[PDB]
Amino acid sequence: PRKVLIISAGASHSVALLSGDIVCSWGRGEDGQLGHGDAEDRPSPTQLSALDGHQIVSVTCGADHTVAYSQSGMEVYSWGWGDFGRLGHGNSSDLFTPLPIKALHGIRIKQIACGDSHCLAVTMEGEVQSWGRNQNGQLGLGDTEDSLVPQKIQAFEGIRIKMVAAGAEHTAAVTEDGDLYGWGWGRYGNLGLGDRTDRLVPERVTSTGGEKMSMVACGWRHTISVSYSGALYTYGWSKYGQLGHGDLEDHLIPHKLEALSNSFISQISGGWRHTMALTSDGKLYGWGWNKFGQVGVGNNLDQCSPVQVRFPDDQKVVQVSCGWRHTLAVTERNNVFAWGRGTNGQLGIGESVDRNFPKIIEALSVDGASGQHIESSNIDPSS
Amino acid sequence: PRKVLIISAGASHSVALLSGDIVCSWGRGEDGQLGHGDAEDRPSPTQLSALDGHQIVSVTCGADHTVAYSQSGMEVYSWGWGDFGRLGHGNSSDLFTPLPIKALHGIRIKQIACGDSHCLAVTMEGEVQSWGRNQNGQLGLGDTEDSLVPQKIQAFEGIRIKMVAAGAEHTAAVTEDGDLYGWGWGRYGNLGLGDRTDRLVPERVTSTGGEKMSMVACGWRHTISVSYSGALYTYGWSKYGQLGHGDLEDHLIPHKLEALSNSFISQISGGWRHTMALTSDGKLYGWGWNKFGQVGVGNNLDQCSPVQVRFPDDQKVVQVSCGWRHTLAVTERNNVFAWGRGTNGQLGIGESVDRNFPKIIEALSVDGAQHIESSNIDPS
């Protein structure tokens, strides 16, 4: 019966929104990021009962916290690790069950990005509010003091923002008109501004291959964008080849990934040390650090150039999301796959070793012989 | 029949040095912090074979990395999560097996402290070198750029340092003559300097009532010191009551813990959000965040004043080390106990739920025994 609408991966956890107004989560539970009230890891997708009936329309993971929002309810919810104010409730308290971010009540939300310890929300009118750690200017407020509550980014006054993205300690955004911005911790060139200097307010990227940009995403210390013509650009850290240019060189400005130049990129995701890109014809390409199999190409060797991730019967991919050591994807057939590190249960396939090529999550998928059952949190996850 | 000489706890792992100069480790293995060459958690104490025969005399855990040194070998080793240069090898590579910090070769080491992502070593001549993340000045080098290799702290020229300590992003030290210093991230008052501002070089804590400090330790965002008279001082963050003053107030300068004024504190340790102090007569007191039972008092309720941790037959405690969510201790009977969060195997008692009061580690104890395991064993 239930379709997977949205998937998101955090550092060691995974969250999905399903049709029928249901959120589920699995993986590491130690900081409360799963939202079930307890602190235990969940190796199988588990219904987040506190959100039943809340008409949630989106979920987004940060490293060790989760955010979700309801259009109808006019509410944004957060839970997980609370340090530095990343949950936005005016304190640093962890939450093991979702609580509304009261400052955002009644605000019409378009999109939310979560990094390691900061978050941002774009409104329907293209305004941006940010909160959390700000030691390197990543909130975009023009200082270096953390904020425990959402703050309007005054620098974007009179500019319609389309989407935001957030890494460990940096932030990026694209406007509706195609401009690309970067701010925060900039030491690995990850802002795309041609230097290694932090920025306390958003600064526009001027080296964009002459192109307007339609989307952006952040990995831990790297950044990915897609241009109006569907070309893919990466910048920042490439120690593990996560920039995908066939070498291990950092780039301080956006650098077009030439190997994918004949494809039109439709979705992008940045992991800890790896990267995913989805083409308009449904082909998924992964690259970067592959120690735990998170690139999904059937080995544990790092990949400094894009390699297509393969699925049964070559079924097309429609969604992808990178965690720190795992990756999740949804296919056209409404199957959900996961691969990579499995030690916290983040793959959602029950108790399992790590996987280096895509494995179907039976509880969430049409196929797999059984489209099994998401579990109640009252089930003991160690049993 | 092997005595446990030193215990040290990291965020989610545990390391010990045994007689015969044997190193063992257990708990979270994902970042290489156990040093066995694989990435798997170890729920039981496991011999770190790469250090067999290296005559290691000390081990020290950071959050997700570990350091050790040999006097005879004149060598310092590090392994685990490599980002920001915390391992000190001139790169950002993680290490799943110990490698020597070549910059420290041939230097006589007195003590090493490890924080979240920076480390410091004190030499036998009282000089200090630091390395790792420096975004908030925690290296004490006068800037905010990370260092992938050890660097001398010039600010201490002419000052003989006795011991150092490191938290998440801050650092503290005491001199041989009892002066106390702090530097790095200072937003919760944890530097002890009377404000909430960072420092980029070491600065002396001038408000100690003229009292000299024999030792200092750091928790994640709090700091603990002991005077030459054995008085316990805490400062910094007390959101979880980890300063132990019977309330939840931060303190910007060192503050005497009045409730223990009749005891002489011999050892101290700071955890993520909890604290341990050991008296000269072997009584262990814990306080702070207790969600996972890490305070060791038989429940899961936070404690904002010291409570004595009880052991079987009231056996005296001789060593204690706080992790992020667990605690380790060694007793007079050569028994080793662990308590708190157990999900990564950090308690070392085999696969286990969390524990809220001390549980014996059979592999390392007299009361006590199974044995330490080879890394070849399947931990699953």
Side-chain angles (χ1 to χ4, degrees), chain A residues 1-382, chain B:
Chain A
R2 279 193 253 261
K3 196 157 193 285
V4 176
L5 298 169
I6 294 179
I7 46 160
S8 182
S12 310
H13 74 296
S14 306
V15 183
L17 169 68
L18 316 182
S19 62
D21 197 17
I22 300 300
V23 174
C24 60
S25 53
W26 62 101
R28 184 171 177 262
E30 189 160 69
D31 280 316
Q33 62 265 64
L34 305 182
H36 305 296
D38 63 275
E40 298 316 298
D41 292 359
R42 298 281 177 166
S44 292
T46 304
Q47 186 167 344
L48 204 171
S49 57
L51 291 179
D52 291 352
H54 283 63
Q55 304 175 256
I56 298 300
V57 300
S58 185
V59 293
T60 302
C61 299
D64 296 307
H65 75 276
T66 315
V67 174
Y69 71 92
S70 170
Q71 280 196 355
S72 187
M74 308 174 295
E75 292 269 53
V76 174
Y77 301 88
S78 64
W79 58 102
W81 190 4
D83 279 310
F84 316 129
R86 77 192 75 178
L87 304 181
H89 304 289
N91 63 50
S92 283
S93 300
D94 308 329
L95 290 172
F96 284 73
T97 306
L99 272 184
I101 301 178
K102 284 202 154 54
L104 296 176
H105 175 84
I107 294 181
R108 303 203 300 171
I109 302 293
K110 180 183 257 285
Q111 188 244 341
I112 299 187
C114 301
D116 270 29
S117 48
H118 68 296
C119 304
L120 304 90
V122 183
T123 74
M124 287 296 324
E125 286 69 38
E127 299 184 38
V128 185
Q129 299 205 28
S130 62
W131 62 95
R133 190 178 168 116
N134 194 28
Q135 294 299 300
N136 294 78
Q138 59 266 54
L139 295 191
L141 308 176
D143 52 65
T144 52
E145 286 91 37
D146 300 349
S147 179
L148 310 178
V149 306
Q151 301 281 350
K152 188 172 317 177
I153 298 182
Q154 301 299 342
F156 281 144
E157 217 254 304
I159 296 171
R160 292 192 58 193
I161 298 299
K162 174 190 182 184
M163 84 177 288
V164 290
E169 307 181 270
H170 77 290
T171 314
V174 290
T175 69
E176 291 286 354
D177 190 67
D179 284 348
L180 175 66
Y181 288 79
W183 63 99
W185 184 98
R187 314 297 170 96
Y188 295 172
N190 46 285
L191 264 32
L193 304 173
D195 53 63
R196 294 180 170 89
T197 310
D198 299 347
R199 299 297 202 283
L200 307 188
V201 294
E203 176 176 306
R204 182 161 49 206
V205 172
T206 50
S207 303
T208 66
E211 294 202 277
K212 286 174 175 302
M213 298 290 173
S214 72
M215 56 194 41
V216 65
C218 295
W220 208 51
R221 315 261 162 196
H222 70 298
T223 310
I224 304 115
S225 68
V226 180
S227 75
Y228 276 17
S229 66
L232 183 72
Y233 293 77
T234 60
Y235 46 108
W237 202 24
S238 211
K239 175 170 174 64
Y240 303 91
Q242 66 264 51
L243 294 191
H245 301 293
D247 61 36
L248 308 176
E249 306 273 334
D250 302 336
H251 286 270
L252 311 189
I253 58 172
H255 196 57
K256 180 174 178 174
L257 209 171
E258 301 294 342
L260 284 168
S261 67
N262 289 323
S263 296
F264 196 105
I265 302 304
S266 289
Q267 306 291 347
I268 47 171
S269 185
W272 197 31
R273 298 167 170 178
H274 73 300
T275 307
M276 290 282 160
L278 179 62
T279 74
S280 60
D281 61 3
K283 299 183 193 308
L284 178 62
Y285 293 87
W287 57 95
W289 195 47
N290 195 29
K291 180 184 181 74
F292 301 116
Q294 65 262 55
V295 178
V297 296
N299 60 60
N300 295 77
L301 305 172
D302 292 357
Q303 304 292 329
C304 63
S305 287
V307 181
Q308 184 179 1
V309 183
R310 299 294 182 156
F311 294 81
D313 302 332
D314 301 318
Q315 59 193 277
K316 291 169 186 179
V317 176
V318 296
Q319 299 180 17
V320 60
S321 183
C322 293
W324 279 26
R325 302 173 178 86
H326 75 301
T327 307
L328 307 172
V330 179
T331 72
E332 60 177 345
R333 294 187 186 178
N334 196 40
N335 295 320
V336 187
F337 292 82
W339 58 95
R341 183 70 162 170
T343 189
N344 284 114
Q346 60 266 59
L347 303 182
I349 61 184
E351 184 183 326
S352 175
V353 296
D354 306 341
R355 304 286 174 169
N356 68 21
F357 66 96
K359 192 90 145 52
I360 192 164
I361 304 182
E362 299 203 29
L364 295 179
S365 306
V366 167
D367 295 329
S370 255
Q372 273 181 359
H373 100 121
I374 82 183
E375 290 185 2
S376 148
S377 68
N378 294 316
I379 285 176
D380 179 6
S382 61
Chain B
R2 281 195 201 275
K3 313 286 181 169
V4 177
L5 304 180
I6 297 174
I7 48 159
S8 184
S12 311
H13 72 296
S14 303
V15 181
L17 176 67
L18 313 179
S19 48
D21 291 330
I22 298 294
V23 176
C24 58
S25 60
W26 62 99
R28 183 168 178 265
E30 189 166 62
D31 282 323
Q33 62 266 59
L34 307 179
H36 304 301
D38 65 79
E40 299 313 300
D41 294 354
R42 298 284 174 165
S44 295
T46 304
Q47 184 158 353
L48 208 173
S49 57
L51 294 177
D52 289 349
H54 288 240
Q55 298 177 254
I56 300 296
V57 304
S58 186
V59 296
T60 301
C61 293
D64 293 306
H65 71 281
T66 312
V67 175
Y69 73 89
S70 173
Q71 297 183 297
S72 194
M74 306 177 286
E75 203 85 270
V76 180
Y77 301 82
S78 63
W79 58 99
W81 188 2
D83 277 313
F84 316 127
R86 76 194 74 179
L87 303 182
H89 305 290
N91 58 60
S92 282
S93 300
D94 307 332
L95 293 175
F96 289 73
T97 305
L99 281 184
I101 301 179
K102 293 188 305 294
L104 298 177
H105 180 87
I107 300 188
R108 296 187 196 271
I109 303 299
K110 180 184 252 295
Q111 187 241 346
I112 301 175
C114 297
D116 267 29
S117 44
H118 69 296
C119 302
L120 303 88
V122 184
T123 74
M124 288 295 296
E125 296 183 19
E127 295 170 18
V128 180
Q129 305 196 21
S130 58
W131 62 95
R133 189 180 166 114
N134 195 28
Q135 295 300 302
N136 292 79
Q138 56 266 50
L139 299 191
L141 303 173
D143 60 46
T144 55
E145 304 300 326
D146 301 342
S147 189
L148 307 186
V149 296
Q151 303 271 68
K152 295 178 173 176
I153 302 191
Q154 260 206 129
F156 283 141
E157 283 169 0
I159 296 168
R160 277 177 72 247
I161 295 301
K162 175 181 182 184
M163 82 171 305
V164 289
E169 309 180 272
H170 77 292
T171 314
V174 297
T175 69
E176 289 295 346
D177 71 345
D179 286 341
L180 173 66
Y181 286 80
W183 64 98
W185 188 97
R187 317 283 164 113
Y188 291 159
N190 47 286
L191 264 32
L193 301 169
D195 58 48
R196 296 183 192 274
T197 296
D198 306 345
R199 298 297 194 280
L200 304 191
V201 295
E203 180 166 319
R204 191 175 82 87
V205 172
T206 59
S207 295
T208 69
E211 287 299 88
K212 298 297 183 287
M213 306 293 174
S214 59
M215 44 173 57
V216 64
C218 298
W220 206 55
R221 311 274 168 188
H222 71 294
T223 312
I224 307 123
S225 70
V226 180
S227 68
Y228 284 151
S229 73
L232 181 72
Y233 293 75
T234 58
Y235 48 104
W237 204 26
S238 211
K239 178 180 168 58
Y240 302 94
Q242 65 264 51
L243 301 190
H245 300 294
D247 55 39
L248 306 173
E249 303 208 31
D250 298 346
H251 282 267
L252 311 189
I253 67 165
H255 192 61
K256 265 176 178 174
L257 207 167
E258 199 175 49
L260 286 165
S261 69
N262 273 319
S263 295
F264 191 100
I265 299 312
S266 291
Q267 307 287 349
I268 49 176
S269 187
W272 199 34
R273 300 165 170 179
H274 73 300
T275 309
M276 289 285 150
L278 174 69
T279 73
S280 68
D281 46 31
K283 298 198 194 318
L284 179 63
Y285 290 87
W287 59 94
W289 192 47
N290 196 28
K291 179 184 188 67
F292 301 117
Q294 64 265 50
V295 171
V297 296
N299 61 54
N300 298 80
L301 312 176
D302 291 358
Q303 306 292 326
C304 66
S305 296
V307 180
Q308 184 182 176
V309 183
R310 304 287 176 162
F311 291 80
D313 297 324
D314 308 303
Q315 60 192 276
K316 291 183 181 180
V317 175
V318 299
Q319 295 184 71
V320 64
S321 190
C322 297
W324 278 26
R325 300 173 180 85
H326 74 301
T327 311
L328 306 171
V330 184
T331 72
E332 57 178 350
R333 298 188 182 169
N334 306 128
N335 293 326
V336 183
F337 286 85
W339 59 92
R341 185 67 164 171
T343 188
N344 284 118
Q346 62 264 59
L347 305 181
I349 59 177
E351 185 182 14
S352 174
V353 291
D354 303 348
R355 308 287 182 168
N356 58 27
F357 69 97
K359 192 93 188 305
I360 198 166
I361 300 181
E362 304 254 355
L364 301 176
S365 306
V366 167
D367 294 340
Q370 46 263 206
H371 27 49
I372 65 182
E373 291 181 355
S374 155
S375 66
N376 290 320
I377 301 181
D378 197 323
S380 309

